[PDB]
Coordinates of C-alpha atoms in Angstrom, one line a residue:
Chain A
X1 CA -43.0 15.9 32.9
X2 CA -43.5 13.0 30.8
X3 CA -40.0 12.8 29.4
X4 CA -38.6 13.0 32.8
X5 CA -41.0 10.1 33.9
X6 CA -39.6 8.5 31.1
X7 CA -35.8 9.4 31.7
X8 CA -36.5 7.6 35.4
X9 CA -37.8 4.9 34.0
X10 CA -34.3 4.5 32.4
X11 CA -37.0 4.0 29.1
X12 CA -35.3 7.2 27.4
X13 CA -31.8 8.3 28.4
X14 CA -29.2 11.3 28.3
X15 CA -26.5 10.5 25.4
X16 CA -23.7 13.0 24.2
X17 CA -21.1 11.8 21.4
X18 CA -18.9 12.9 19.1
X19 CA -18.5 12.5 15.1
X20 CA -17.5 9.9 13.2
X21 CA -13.7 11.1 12.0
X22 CA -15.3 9.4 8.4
X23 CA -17.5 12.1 8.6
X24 CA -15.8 15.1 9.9
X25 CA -13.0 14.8 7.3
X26 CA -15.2 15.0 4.5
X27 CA -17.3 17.5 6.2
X28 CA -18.5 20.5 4.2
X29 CA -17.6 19.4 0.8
X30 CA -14.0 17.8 1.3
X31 CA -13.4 15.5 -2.0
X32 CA -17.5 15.7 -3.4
X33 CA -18.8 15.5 -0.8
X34 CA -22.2 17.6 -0.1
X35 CA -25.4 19.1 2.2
X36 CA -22.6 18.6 5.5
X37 CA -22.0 22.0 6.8
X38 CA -20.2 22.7 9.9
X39 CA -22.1 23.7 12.9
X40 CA -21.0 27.5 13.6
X41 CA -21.6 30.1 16.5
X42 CA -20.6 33.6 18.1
X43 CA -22.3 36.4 19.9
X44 CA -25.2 39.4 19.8
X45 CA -24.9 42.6 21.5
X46 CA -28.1 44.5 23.0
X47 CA -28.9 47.0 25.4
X48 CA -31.0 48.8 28.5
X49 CA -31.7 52.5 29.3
X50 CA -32.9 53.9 32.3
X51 CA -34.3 57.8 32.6
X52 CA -34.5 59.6 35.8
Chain B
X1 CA -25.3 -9.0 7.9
X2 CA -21.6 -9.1 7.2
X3 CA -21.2 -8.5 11.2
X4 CA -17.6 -6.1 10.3
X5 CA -20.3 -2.7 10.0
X6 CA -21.2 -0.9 6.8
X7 CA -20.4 2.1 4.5
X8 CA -23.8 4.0 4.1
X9 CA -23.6 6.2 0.8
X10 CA -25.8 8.6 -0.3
X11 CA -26.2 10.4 -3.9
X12 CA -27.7 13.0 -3.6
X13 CA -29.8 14.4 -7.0
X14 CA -28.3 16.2 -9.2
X15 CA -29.3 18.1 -12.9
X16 CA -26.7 17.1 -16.0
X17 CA -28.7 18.6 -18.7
X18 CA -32.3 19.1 -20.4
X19 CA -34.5 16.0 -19.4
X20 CA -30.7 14.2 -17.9
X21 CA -30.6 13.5 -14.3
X22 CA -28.4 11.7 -12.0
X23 CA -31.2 10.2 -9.4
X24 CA -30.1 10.2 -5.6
X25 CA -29.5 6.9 -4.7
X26 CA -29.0 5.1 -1.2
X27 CA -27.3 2.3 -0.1
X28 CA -25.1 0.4 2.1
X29 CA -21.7 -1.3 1.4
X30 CA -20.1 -4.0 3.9
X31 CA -17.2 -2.3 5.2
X32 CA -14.7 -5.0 4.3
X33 CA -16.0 -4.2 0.6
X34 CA -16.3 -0.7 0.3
X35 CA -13.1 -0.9 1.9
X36 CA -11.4 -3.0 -0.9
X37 CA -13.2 -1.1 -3.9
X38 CA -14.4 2.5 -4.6
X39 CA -15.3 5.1 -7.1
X40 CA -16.8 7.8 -5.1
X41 CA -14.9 11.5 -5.6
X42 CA -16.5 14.3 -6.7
X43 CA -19.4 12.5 -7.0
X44 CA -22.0 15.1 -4.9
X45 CA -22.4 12.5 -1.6
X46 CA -22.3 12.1 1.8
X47 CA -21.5 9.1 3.7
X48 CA -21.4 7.5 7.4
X49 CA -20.9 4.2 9.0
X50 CA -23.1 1.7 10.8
X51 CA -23.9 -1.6 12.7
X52 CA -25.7 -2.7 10.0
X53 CA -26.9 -1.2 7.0
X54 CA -28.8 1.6 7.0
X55 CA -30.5 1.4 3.7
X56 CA -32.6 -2.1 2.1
X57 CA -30.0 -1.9 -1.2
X58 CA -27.1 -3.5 0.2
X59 CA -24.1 -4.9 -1.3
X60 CA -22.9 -7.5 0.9
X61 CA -18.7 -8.8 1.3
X62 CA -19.3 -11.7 -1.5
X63 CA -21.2 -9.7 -4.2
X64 CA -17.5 -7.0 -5.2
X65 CA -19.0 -7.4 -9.0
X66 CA -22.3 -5.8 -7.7
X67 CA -20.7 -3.2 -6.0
X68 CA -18.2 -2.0 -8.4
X69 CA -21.3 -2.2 -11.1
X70 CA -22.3 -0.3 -8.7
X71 CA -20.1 2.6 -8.1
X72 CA -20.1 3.5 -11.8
X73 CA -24.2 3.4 -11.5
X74 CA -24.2 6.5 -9.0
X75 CA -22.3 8.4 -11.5
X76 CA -25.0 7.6 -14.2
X77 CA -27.6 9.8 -16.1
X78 CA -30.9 9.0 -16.9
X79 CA -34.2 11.1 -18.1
Chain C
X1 CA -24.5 3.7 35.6
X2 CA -26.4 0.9 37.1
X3 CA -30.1 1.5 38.9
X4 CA -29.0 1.9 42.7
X5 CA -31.2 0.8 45.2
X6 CA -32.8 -2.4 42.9
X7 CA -32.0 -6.2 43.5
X8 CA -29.8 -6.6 46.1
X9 CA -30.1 -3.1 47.6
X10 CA -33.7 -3.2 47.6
X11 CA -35.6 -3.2 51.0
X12 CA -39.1 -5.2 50.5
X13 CA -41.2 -2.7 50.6
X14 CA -39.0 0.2 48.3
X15 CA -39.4 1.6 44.7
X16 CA -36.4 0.0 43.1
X17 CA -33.8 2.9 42.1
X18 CA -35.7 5.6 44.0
X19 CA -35.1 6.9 47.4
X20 CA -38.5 8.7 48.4
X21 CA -38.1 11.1 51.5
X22 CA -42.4 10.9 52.1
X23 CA -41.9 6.8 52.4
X24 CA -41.6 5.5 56.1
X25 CA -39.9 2.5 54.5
X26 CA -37.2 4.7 52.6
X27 CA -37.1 7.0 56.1
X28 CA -36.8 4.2 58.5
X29 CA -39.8 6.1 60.2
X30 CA -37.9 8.7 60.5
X31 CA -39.8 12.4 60.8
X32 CA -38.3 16.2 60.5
X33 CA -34.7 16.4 58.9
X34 CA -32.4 15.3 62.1
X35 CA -33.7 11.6 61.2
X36 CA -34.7 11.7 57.6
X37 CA -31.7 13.0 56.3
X38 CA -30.0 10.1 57.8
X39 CA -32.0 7.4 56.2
X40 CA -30.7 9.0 53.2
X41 CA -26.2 8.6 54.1
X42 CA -27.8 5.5 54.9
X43 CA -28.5 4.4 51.8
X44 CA -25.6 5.9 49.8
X45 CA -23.6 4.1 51.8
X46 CA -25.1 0.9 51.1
X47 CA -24.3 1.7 47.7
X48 CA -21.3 2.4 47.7
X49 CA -20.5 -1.1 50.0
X50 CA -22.3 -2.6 46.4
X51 CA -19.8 -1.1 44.2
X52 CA -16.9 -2.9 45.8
Chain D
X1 CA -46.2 51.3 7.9
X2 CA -43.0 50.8 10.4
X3 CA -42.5 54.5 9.7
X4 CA -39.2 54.0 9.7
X5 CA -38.2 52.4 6.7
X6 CA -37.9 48.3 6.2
X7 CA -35.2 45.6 5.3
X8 CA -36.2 44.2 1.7
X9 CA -35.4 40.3 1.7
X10 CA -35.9 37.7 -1.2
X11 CA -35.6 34.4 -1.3
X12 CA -34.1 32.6 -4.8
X13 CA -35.4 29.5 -6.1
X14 CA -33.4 26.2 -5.2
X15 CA -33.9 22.4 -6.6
X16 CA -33.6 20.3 -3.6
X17 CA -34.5 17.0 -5.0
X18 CA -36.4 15.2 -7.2
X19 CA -40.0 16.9 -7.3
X20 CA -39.1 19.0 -4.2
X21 CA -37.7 22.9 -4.4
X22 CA -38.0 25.7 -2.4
X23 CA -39.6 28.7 -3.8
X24 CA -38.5 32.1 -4.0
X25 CA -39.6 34.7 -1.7
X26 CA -40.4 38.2 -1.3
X27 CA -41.0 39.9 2.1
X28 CA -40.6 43.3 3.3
X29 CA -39.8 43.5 7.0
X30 CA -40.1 46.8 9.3
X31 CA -36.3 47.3 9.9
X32 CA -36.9 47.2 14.0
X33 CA -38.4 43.9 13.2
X34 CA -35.8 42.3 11.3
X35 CA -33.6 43.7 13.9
X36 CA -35.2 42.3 16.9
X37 CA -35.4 38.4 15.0
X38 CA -34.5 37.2 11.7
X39 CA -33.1 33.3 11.1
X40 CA -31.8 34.0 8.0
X41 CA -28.3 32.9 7.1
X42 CA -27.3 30.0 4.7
X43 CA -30.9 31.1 2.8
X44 CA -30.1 32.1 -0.6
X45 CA -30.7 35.4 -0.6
X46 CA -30.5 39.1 -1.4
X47 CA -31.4 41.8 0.5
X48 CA -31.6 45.8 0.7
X49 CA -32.9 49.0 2.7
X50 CA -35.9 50.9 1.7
X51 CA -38.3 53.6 3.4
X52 CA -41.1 52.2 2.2
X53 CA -41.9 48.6 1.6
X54 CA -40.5 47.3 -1.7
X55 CA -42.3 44.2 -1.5
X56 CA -46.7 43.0 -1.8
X57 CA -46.0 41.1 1.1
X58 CA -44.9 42.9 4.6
X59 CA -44.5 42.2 8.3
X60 CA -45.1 45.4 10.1
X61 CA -43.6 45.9 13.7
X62 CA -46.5 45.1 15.7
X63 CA -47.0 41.5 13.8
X64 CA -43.9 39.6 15.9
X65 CA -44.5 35.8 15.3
X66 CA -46.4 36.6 11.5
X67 CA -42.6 37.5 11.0
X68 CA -41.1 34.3 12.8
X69 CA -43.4 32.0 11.1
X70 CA -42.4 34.2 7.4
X71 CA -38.8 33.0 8.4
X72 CA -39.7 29.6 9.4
X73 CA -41.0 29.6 5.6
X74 CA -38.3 30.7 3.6
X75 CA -36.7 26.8 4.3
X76 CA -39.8 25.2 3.5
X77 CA -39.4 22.9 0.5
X78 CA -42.9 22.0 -1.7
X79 CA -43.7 19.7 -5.1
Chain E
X1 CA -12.9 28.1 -43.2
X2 CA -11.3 30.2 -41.5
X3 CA -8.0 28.4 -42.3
X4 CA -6.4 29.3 -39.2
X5 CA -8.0 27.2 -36.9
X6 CA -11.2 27.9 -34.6
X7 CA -12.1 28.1 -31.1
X8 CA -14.4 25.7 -30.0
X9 CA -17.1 26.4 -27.3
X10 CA -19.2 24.7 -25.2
X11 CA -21.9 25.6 -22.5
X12 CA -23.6 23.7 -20.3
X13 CA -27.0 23.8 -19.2
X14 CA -28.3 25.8 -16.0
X15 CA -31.1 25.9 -14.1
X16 CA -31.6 29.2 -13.8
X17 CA -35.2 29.4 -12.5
X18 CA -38.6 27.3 -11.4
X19 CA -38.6 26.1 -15.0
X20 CA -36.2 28.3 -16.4
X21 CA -33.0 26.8 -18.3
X22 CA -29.9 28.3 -20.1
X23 CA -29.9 25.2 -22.9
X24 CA -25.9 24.5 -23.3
X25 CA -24.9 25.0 -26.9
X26 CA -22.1 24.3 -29.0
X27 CA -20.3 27.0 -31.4
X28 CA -17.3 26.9 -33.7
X29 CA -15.8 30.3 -33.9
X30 CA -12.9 31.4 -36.1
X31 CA -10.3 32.1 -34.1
X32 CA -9.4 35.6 -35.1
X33 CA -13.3 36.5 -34.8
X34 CA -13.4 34.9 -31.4
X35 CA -10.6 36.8 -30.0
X36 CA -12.1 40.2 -31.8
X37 CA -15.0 39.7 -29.4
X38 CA -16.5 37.0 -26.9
X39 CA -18.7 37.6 -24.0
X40 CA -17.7 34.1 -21.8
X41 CA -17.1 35.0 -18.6
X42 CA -18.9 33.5 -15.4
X43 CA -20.6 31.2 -18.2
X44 CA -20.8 27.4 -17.3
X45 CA -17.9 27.0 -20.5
X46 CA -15.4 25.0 -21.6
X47 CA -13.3 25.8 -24.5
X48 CA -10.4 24.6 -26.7
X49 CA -8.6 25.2 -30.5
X50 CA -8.8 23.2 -33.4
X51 CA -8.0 23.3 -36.9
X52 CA -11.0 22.6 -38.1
X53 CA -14.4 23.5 -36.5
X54 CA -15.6 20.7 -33.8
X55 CA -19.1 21.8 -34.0
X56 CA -21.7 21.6 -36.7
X57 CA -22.8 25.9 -36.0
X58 CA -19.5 27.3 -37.1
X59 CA -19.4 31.4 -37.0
X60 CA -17.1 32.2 -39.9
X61 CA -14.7 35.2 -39.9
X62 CA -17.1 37.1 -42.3
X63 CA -19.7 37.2 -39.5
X64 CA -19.0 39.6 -36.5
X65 CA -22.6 40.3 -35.9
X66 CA -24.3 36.9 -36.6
X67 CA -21.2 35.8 -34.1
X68 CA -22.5 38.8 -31.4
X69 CA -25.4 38.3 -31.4
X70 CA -24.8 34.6 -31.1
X71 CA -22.5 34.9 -28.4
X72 CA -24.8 37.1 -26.5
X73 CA -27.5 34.3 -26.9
X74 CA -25.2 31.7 -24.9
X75 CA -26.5 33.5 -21.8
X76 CA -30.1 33.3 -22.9
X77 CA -33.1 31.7 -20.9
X78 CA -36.2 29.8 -21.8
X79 CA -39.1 28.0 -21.1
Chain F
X1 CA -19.4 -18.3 3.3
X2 CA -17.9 -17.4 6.4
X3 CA -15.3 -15.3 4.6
X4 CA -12.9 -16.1 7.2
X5 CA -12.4 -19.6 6.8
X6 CA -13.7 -22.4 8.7
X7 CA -13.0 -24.7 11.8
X8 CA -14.0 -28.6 10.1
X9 CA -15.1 -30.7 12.9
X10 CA -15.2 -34.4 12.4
X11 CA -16.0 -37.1 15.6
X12 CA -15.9 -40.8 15.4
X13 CA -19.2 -42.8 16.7
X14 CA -18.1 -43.9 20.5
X15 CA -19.3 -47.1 21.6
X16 CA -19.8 -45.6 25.1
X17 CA -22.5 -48.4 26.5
X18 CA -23.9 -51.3 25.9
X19 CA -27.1 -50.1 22.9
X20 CA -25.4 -46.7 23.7
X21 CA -23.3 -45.1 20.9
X22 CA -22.4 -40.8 20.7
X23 CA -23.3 -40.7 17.0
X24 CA -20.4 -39.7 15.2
X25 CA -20.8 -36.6 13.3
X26 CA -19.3 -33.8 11.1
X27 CA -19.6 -30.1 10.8
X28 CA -18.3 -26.8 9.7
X29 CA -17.8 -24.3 11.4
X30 CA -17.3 -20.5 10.7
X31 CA -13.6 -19.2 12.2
X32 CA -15.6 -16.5 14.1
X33 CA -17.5 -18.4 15.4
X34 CA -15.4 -21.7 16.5
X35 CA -13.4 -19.8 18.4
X36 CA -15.7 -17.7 20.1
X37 CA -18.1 -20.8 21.5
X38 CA -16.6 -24.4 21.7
X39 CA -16.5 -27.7 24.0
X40 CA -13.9 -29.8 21.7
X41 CA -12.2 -31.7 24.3
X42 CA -12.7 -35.0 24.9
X43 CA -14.9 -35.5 21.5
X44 CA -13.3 -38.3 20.0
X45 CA -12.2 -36.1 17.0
X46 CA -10.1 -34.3 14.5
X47 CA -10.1 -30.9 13.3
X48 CA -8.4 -28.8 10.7
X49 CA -8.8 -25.4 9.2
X50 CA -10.3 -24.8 5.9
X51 CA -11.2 -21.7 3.0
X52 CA -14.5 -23.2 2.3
X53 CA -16.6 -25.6 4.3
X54 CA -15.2 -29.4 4.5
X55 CA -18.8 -30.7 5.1
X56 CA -22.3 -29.7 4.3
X57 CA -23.9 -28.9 7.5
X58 CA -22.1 -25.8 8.2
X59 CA -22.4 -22.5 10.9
X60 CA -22.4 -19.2 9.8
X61 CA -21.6 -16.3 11.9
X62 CA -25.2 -15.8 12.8
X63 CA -26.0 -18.9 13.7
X64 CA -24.5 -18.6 17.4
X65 CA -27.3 -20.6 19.4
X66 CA -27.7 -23.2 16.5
X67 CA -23.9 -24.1 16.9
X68 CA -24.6 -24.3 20.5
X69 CA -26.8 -26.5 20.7
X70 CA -24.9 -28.6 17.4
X71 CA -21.7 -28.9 19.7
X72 CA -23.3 -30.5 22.7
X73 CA -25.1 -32.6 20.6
X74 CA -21.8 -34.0 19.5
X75 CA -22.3 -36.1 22.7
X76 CA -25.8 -37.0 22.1
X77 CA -26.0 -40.5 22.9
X78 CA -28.6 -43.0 21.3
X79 CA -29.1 -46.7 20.5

């Protein structure tokens, strides 16, 4: 509640952007470069069961 | 500030031998410097740009001596 | 985006970058949706006539 | 016991800076509770099946967030 | 001498463990005994020939076992 | 310095009124900065470009508002 309050207030706003290409070429240990790993994702896999 | 941005470089710590260490260090290069002059390959780092710099050692667009003194420093090992 | 309903926009008595349905000021005295909801195309058009 | 058998985990010693490192650790987690969470990857670690617990330190089944915050851990860096 | 040249090896130190370190060392080994028997493999090495010993421990031909046992020792951890 | 040369401003004293004279003044200032903010026209002057400052009263980059101020104060009229 207070963040949106805030977010109103135009005191604290929503920002998205993208990386610096001086970064993302060296990213992950391009020439000596170190501790900048790539972010990385994919998927699970669960499941339900019923009985009569 | 130099007003053209900065190089912020980061060393990050690293072991060379028994009681030798090469100390993470951080600072901040004017762009139109770093730009001109650099020894920084291999050397375990990361680096980004900014507005203004992003660490209090700074090597500013007048001081190149400092900074190439410099770049040789962040490859140095000390106890 | 700019804060809509501020400066210019603003009636008197209003908020400043809020339209509130429970305000008679914002509603124009306006009471169940027939009305109220007008008070609201009311004010996006005003904005929009401040874009141009 | 998770009566079931468990999934072994330990955590190797890393240097992260000067003065800072992150300790090795040893857990043994009941296999249905590794399964249902475990945020390890990137840790720096081995692990392995057992039936019984191969480790002084275990998270049975029924202790959930014990398990979470054991996770949490394995990243924490101290002197 | 061996008079026909040596093999010159060199290890560097590792960190091994909270407090643990591999100390690098430096070997001359006669070439024919280094190539009868040397464990370097996955070691932290360099090497290279010479025809004299570059190193001031120098395993002779007439050593195999003081040379083992040395070699062995490369990989050895201490306080 | 400026590191991008300088705009030299020189003005001539301009007997405008009787025990009324626009002191005549000169100043240098940064490229940058000349070009982004100026009222030379009708100043009673000269200009040329320069590597270094011409004179000693000079404007860096971040003195925006002190330039300002110094170039409508070219006209300042006094006794």
């Amino acid at each position: 509640a207070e963040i949106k309050k805030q977010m109103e207030a135009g005191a604290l706003v929503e920002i998205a952007e993208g990386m610096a290409t001086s970064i993302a070429e060296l990213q992950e240990g391009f020439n000596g470069s170190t501790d900048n790993p790539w972010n990385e994702m994919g998927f699970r896999i669960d499941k339900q069961v019923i009985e009569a | 500030a130099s007003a053209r941005g900065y190089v912020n470089i980061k060393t990050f710590e690293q072991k060379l031998d028994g009681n030798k260490k090469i100390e993470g260090k951080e600072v901040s290069v004017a762009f139109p410097l770093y730009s001109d002059v650099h020894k920084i390959s291999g050397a375990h780092y990361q680096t980004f740009p900014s507005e203004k710099a992003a660490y209090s050692t700074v090597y500013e667009e007048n001081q190149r001596t400092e900074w190439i003194a410099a770049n040789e420093d962040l490859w140095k090992v000390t106890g | 985006a700019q804060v809509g309903k501020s400066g210019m926009t603003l009636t008197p008595g209003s908020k400043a970058g809020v339209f509130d349905f429970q305000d008679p000021i914002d509603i124009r005295g306006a009471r169940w949706a027939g009305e109220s909801f007008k008070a609201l195309l009311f004010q996006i058009d005003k904005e929009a006539v401040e874009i141009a």
